[PDB]
Amino acid sequence: MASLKAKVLETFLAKSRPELLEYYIKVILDYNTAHNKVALSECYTVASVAEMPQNYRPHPQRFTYCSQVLGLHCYKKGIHYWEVELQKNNFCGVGICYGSMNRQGPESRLGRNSASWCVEWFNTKISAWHNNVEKTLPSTKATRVGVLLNCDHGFVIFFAVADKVHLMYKFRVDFTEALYPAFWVFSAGATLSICSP
Ligand SMILES: *CC(=O)N1CCCN(C(=O)c2ccc(-c3ccccc3)c(C)c2)CC1
Numbered sequence: 268m269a270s271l272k273a274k275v276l277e278t279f280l281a282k283s284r285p286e287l288l289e290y291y292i293k294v295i296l297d298y299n300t301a302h303n304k305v306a307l308s309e310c311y312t313v314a315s316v317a318e319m320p321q322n323y324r325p326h327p328q329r330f331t332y333c334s335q336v337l338g339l340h341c342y343k344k345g346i347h348y349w350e351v352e353l354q355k356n357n358f359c360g361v362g363i364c365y366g367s368m369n370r371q372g373p374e375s376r377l378g379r380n381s382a383s384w385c386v387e388w389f390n391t392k393i394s395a396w397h398n399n400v401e402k403t404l405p406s407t408k409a410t411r412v413g414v415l416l417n418c419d420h421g422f423v424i425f426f427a428v429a430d431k432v433h434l435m436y437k438f439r440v441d442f443t444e445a446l447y448p449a450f451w452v453f454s455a456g457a458t459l460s461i462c463s464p
Contacts, residue, residue, distance in 0.1 A: 272420040284432045290348040294448050294461045295339045299326045304334040315458040333376045338448035347416045352460040360387035360451035361412045365444050386425045395436035
């Protein structure tokens with residue numbers, strides 16, 4: 268149903284922030300996945316860089332190579348929106364990934380494998396990543412990203428969220444398994460906050 272999928276994508280690309288909030292889902296960070304450099308706070312809604320490594324209990328799902336963390340729930344059907352506040356001028360990333368993504372080694376890095384899609388702030392520049400292919404984006408003064416995941420018609424949209432929403436990047440994928448919200452923090456004081464609007 269290519270025509271219907273294209274129309275739906277066009278509709279969501281043009282939605283305002285109030286309209287995106289109609290698809291809001293509450294995302295919670297999953298302690299079992301957090302790398303030891305990722306500190307969690309505020310009832311698991313805030314991820315920040317720990318200056319010293321923590322000593323989290325071993326778990327097969329825990330990231331051991333990249334300082335990343337996933338949401339608690341995955342999505343295989345429906346439409347989902349969530350927003351992440353970021354501290355400005357930091358190395359960090361917001362994305363989505365399949366549960367089957369590796370949790371160990373360089374293959375676990377968001378956007379550097381076939382199983383994940385993200386936008387990333389890296390050396391004050393903004394890029395979109397999937398399958399180890401980088402796309403440079405124009406800078407934004409927004410300190411908030413909105414992720415619109417449409418499982419039913421196969422796309423994810425990353426919005427820069429300010430007084431209005433602006434497109435950062437989108438991907439069309441016929442997703443093959445459920446998706447987790449995914450997060451990367453690296454620079455000192457980098458912080459990703461799942462907002463409650
Ligand atoms: C994916 C991840 O978080 N890792 C842990 C951190 C180090 N690492 C890197 O691959 C990595 C090396 C160098 C930089 C960097 C720092 C400052 C300027 C430019 C690049 C980064 C951001 C990551 C292994 C995996």
